[PDB]
Amino acid sequence: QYSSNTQQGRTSIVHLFEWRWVDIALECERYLAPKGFGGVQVSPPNENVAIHNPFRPAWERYQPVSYKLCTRSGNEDEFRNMVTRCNNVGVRIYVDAVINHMCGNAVSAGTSSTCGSYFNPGSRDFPAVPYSGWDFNDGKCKTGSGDIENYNDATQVRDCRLSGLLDLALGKDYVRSKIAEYMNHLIDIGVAGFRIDASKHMWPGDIKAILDKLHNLNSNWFPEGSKPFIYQEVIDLGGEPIKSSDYFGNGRVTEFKYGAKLGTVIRKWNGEKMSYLKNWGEGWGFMPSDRALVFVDNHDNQRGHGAGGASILTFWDARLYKMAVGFMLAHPYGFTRVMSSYRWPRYFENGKDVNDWVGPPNDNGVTKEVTINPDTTCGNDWVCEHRWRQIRNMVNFRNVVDGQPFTNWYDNGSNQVAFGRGNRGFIVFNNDDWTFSLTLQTGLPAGTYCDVISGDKINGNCTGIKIYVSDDGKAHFSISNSAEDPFIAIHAESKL
Template identity: 50%
Template structure:
């Protein structure tokens, strides 16, 4: 029997308010999206790199069975066929092992989950990565099982300002589940509960705006608490962040979902891209955050790019513009706004391109060069020194305020994070050469962009801070990067 909506809203609100907590270890506070990686490789990466470098968590690709599509494009992962935990990334045992190994080194796992739909039309029988078969055209998915009555009526989205079409018609032909049906809710809750049982910390909910908020409230409120055997406290709720693309003029808005969990702040991605592409002066970033029309900091999942919009033309930056991308990421991780996620991509020349794979169309593992970067089709931005050292910066300055903003009236900016960190950025075509207030105690500090503090020595630039907190800052137009960053954990 369904609860009356008012009762559901009242009982669910207290639970959903807790679903904004990512359950990070210590001072860690950055998620990385290891897009399309295998489970065994993610487990290895947690132990050898992510844990030691202070990453807080990993967003993993969808874990449940999907159709096998010709050429194995990345988007086949978003065409589910059952809730078996078998994909190109690995099977359930490998998934469970990954979650445990990552939790053991303080790196949380967040799963990209597909609650809105099943696979789109397929010629005849579709075969899944776990051996299941289905007839998507008939809305027949026997391995769940779902039948036609578990879906909304077939219709296309032609008007994105028509709530009925957005939430009950088929997104790019994907068979649209009816989350108001008890059976559908039951199967979705069972799926999420199983992932929680295996130790995950939360979920990225794909296509959330295509589902009614009251249906998601019921589902979120019904899932179990996190598994205490994986280091979570009693009564801890899963962290939920929801994909809601809202450019400010949609009928279905992010404000319908932000109390249920965090929401992906796509405007952040677009505006930061405009700024660092030179289409908006960096001086205006002083008021970054809610003054720009963004969600409140604790409700916004923020990113420079994600696996979808990095493939689109426009203002969004990606790895193909590395200098600007690293500057934007440094600002993202230095400025105290949002729940930060960084992207770790594979190289692509067209939008549908498959991740790196062998002749049998199986995923291949990343390989690493002498500097620790990836070298065989994987981009691995999270292993770029300028990015992982800014993750360390963000950890070092956690819970401090932004102070002492400086700019040159154009595209050179600098600011402090309390008395723990300082960053300067130069996006002009001339040198930044200034004596600036760093807010740091007197001493010699390593710039974590051009190098690191290794065995008591700076491998890149250094900055001498005097007894009044001032230091001479130089970022030349010839410099490889347009950023300089120092913090208390990088003091000689």
Template identity: 40%
Template sequence: MRPVVLATITALAGAVVVPSATTPPADEAAAAPITGAEGPIVQMFGWPWESLAEECRSSLGPDGYAAIQVSPPTEHVQLADQGYPWYEDYQPVSYDLRSRRGGAESFENMVAACNGAGVKVYVDAVLNHMSGSGSQDSGPGSGGTEYSKYDYPGTYADSDFHDCREDIADYTDQWEVRNCELVGLADLRTESSKVRDTQLAYLNRLLDMGVSGFRLDGSKHMPPEDIAAIVDGLHETSTGNEPYIYQEVIADSTTRGTEYTGNGDVTTFTYTDRVSSAFAKGSIAGLRNLPEETDLGSGQAVVFVANHDTERDSPPLSYEDGAAYDLANSFTLAFPYGTPRILSGFDFGDDTDAGPPSDDNGFTRPAGCADDGAWVCTHRHTPVAGMVGFNQAVRGTGLNDWWDNGGNVIAFGRGDAGFAVFNSGGAQGQDSGETTRQFRSSLPAGTYCNVLTGRFENGECGGETIEVNSDGTFTTTVEPNSGVALHQDAELGG
């Protein structure tokens, strides 16, 4: 979604109460374990289907990612006069699978390849709206369909859209938020059985192709009961399970994330603001209390450092921040709250509207992690990829053995299965140098691979190794914007 309401994220920052740093006792009660999706998700923003199939086989599957979130596969507007911006994808003109990333056959082949590599596919589904005022007279859609706003032949007619045909003006008015237009996008009557049946036919087609779930774009702009009716009509996945659902809700005083948890998980932008800001400023000790700062339980929340909207909206952290950004993503994979999602997209430079690398007709070129920096492969970065195994190894455990220095260095355990240390580099006025100390964990004695510095593969460590003593202690030096992550499945000789 390309929402004006991203301003709400900034407003949320002002509403967050940041606790003072503390050093609780090592035997504190464990925090609630994660119970959401089955592991880390990667948002492969803008990637074409054939490239995704190869990436699942070569990297995402072997590294242990549970799922990918793919960009909307539906036919969408083409805005040649605007240079084919990224937000074309969020203005559907039909539910045909003919996007700039490929057609139905290449999409289905991608899903099969990723499933075969052990990676589930979640589709970013746009159900709240169709095209917007800005695409009027821009020509046919990416699959050749002729359309106009409120008239999509074979899909929707004028009567399928809400009567409020003005932009949302008052975000404290829930009726406006759910019935008027988000930045000029034609707002669908999701309470209509015709609209729901049309959308269910599309979503169930994807499930029958092997898709495992959906991220529901713009959920805040649809009543939760409308979403419930659609979710209730979904087929089972190809493995006989209920599809995994997570909903984009930018919560505020008018719309709470908890209103939507009956339908599935919910994104929490409070988390995004807190973690991104903390690692950007270097003061991370207060992050211990993250679960208390959102109204969503761990098993209801999808958490992330950045998504395709926030990285374009004056973010505290984005891919341009390098090591600090990777470290924040590593923390998200280590901390016991929510289902973590990593963003891998493309370098848009100073043009926040820029679409993915494309040909002269706006169709996306093949993506790859060696493509001269055009594609940002955060999921492959060593500190991030190494933490996927950590996340899986500590799954179901809570938080223990917390320590912090009141500012830029924190350490915590995940039961006796893992232990992590993060040095964010330090805020202004704080010591931003290296930290050398003895840390106390609940890990069994042994020699462990620090997976923040290198992968653990075939019993060998590609990075630093650390010796843990019989009492769980170890001594090490942690440089700024780096850390230590040890877990039970990365013990040498274990």
């Protein structure tokens, strides 16, 4: 469950949040494969409640109606088409698996669902599965409301309804088997692994019992005995009875400490400075690197949901965001996930984004296609951070330096830092209010290297900055504090 199952020399996954299957399939072929992306985390592919108030929110996808592969992202044919086409170009699919719960207990009965399946939350009837009243935790939960009231109580966090979401009885073999059926369907199609949604809300032992029932990965694409990559969503910043480590037996775990702390550092809040990143990783109290799924922001905290707080960096803060993502992708700690977002009409009323619910770009609820602008950015309000040169090139930086040790660290005691990865890559940051101008040991072979932040190598030349490494590995770097991208990165494959 710990191995990503990505192609050798591909080290990141990108969350193509709310993208349609046909768009992802094309994206794999035209972009993700040639740019060296390891894989795609997709939005939940299973049927959900069509919520009309508010109008088709992002969060409707986290209210299951059945396990039919039928969503705003597309139908089963399109899903199968996407996984095949992506695997065929060496790009993996990871499914957002919503298995803790069905929909909200107060959602109306009917066929307001993405495939038109009937469901009745009040009577606990989901006949397209099927689930009945016997399949939920109503009798197991011990709170007055039936919902989670207190995170200091590990039991109710597991047995009670998250925000009123009907809590599946995962202690039952029937329920475990229905979920395993869904996941095995996905595995056989060719899915490489799963983001396990709301993992904190399930007993580690129940997740395990579900995982016990799963097939090995599709043997046309994956070596015999390959197990699905598992990464579990557990928000653990400390101070709760449930710990990220409780889930290590099942796979990797999201390290939410990662983006919270990095955001604070890059913003220079709370007295934090980039020089403090010298011991980034386990030295910052983070989980073991071999279990961490790391990211700057995710689909929840980029809009203030879940954990996060104000420190989280997102596309809205493009300049600091790129630096934070650049730092993540250069540093060996964790397995990296890059966010890919859509723009929504962000509108604050007393410190709250009243539009944090808004779903993907749409015309009357129909998800808009991802259009590609001439310059390879996206139209239709898709942000496509993964296509921003500064991020895409850092994705390849991580591939190039894979397995190389953190080395040649420099800092000025403030916010000017640099480090290398073995003899394969070097990166330099200026987050101070003055110019960073200095000759530094890069650990790299002598030569002319294209800075992959400002530009690209195109056979024999660079479209941006050029860095000159002399015979002793030293190179001069000059980064103004006024630089729009106040960092530079060079690696073995950017050498002329």
